[PDB]
Design a protein around this ligand. Structure first.
Ligand SMILES: [Ca+2]
Ligand SMILES: [Ca+2]
Ligand SMILES: [Ca+2]
Ligand SMILES: [Ca+2]
Ligand SMILES: [Zn+2]
Ligand SMILES: [Zn+2]
Ligand SMILES: [Zn+2]
Ligand SMILES: [Zn+2]
Ligand SMILES: [Zn+2]
Ligand SMILES: [Zn+2]
Ligand SMILES: [Zn+2]
Lengths: 123, 123
C-alpha cells in the first residue's frame, strides 16, 4: 500500500531525491518491487511515454551493484530492466530511470533531467 | 502538465477534498479533462481495479448539474461517464468517482470510503 506521486517537472537524480524528501516521501523504490503497484506505476508511465527517475543507483558499491534507496538490491538480472540493460560503463556513477524507449529500467549518468515518481508506504 | 498523487487511503468525498488541500493540491479535476493525463490516470486505476474519488459533484447547482471543483461543467453526456450513468436520484447530493466496474465516472452519494487522486497544475 502506498501514496504515489508523479510529477511532470524534471530534475537530475539528486534533486529528484530531495524533491520527494521535502514532501515526506521517497523516490519510488519499494513500490517498484510490489507486483501490483509496479504494474499500476508502469501503466501510467506507459501512457506518458517519458523518462522518469526511480530510487536506485550504484553510488555506494559501484559497478552493477545497484541498490534501491531503502537498501534492497536491484538484481542485475531483474525483469524490471529494459532489454540489454544495464549496459553503461561499470566505472561510471549510475542512476536508474524508467526509460521511455521501453518503459522499463535503465542505467544512466545522474545529471540528466527526468520526471519524478515518489512513494510513501501506508499506514 | 501536472503533479498527480494517488493514495490507497480511503475516505469520504469531503475528506478527500481536505486531504488534497492539506498537501497543496486539489481533488483531480482539470487533469481529467486533459486527453493525455486522463488516459494515464485511468491506466493506473485500471490496474488497481478500485474506486477513486474525483473532483466533481452536484452540490452547487443540484440535480445533474455536475461541476468539477474548478468550476468547469462536467457535461451529463460526457464520454467520461460509465455506461448508463449518471443515474442516481436527482434530489440527492451527488459526488463523482471513478467506478471500478467500468473504470469510468459514476455518480454516488458522498459518504462512502474511496481512494483519492489529487492534482496540481504546473506552470
Ligand atoms: Ca532482461
Ligand atoms: Ca543504459
Ligand atoms: Ca455515455
Ligand atoms: Ca451512479
Ligand atoms: Zn502492495
Ligand atoms: Zn518547468
Ligand atoms: Zn531519455
Ligand atoms: Zn488503513
Ligand atoms: Zn496536458
Ligand atoms: Zn511541460
Ligand atoms: Zn464501488
Amino acid at each position: 500500500d502506498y501514496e504515489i506521486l508523479f510529477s511532470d517537472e524534471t530534475m537530475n537524480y539528486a534533486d529528484a531525491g530531495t524533491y520527494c524528501q521535502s514532501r515526506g516521501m521517497a523516490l519510488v523504490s519499494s513500490a517498484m518491487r510490489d507486483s501490483t503497484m509496479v504494474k499500476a506505476i508502469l501503466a501510467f508511465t506507459e501512457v506518458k511515454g517519458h523518462d522518469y527517475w526511480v530510487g536506485a543507483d550504484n553510488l555506494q558499491d559501484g559497478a552493477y551493484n545497484f541498490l534501491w534507496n531503502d537498501g534492497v538490491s536491484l538484481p542485475t538480472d531483474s525483469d524490471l530492466w529494459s532489454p540489454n540493460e544495464p549496459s553503461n560503463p561499470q566505472s561510471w556513477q549510475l542512476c536508474v530511470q524508467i526509460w521511455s524507449k521501453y518503459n522499463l529500467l535503465d542505467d544512466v549518468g545522474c545529471g540528466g533531467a527526468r520526471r519524478v515518481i515518489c512513494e510513501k508506504e501506508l499506514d
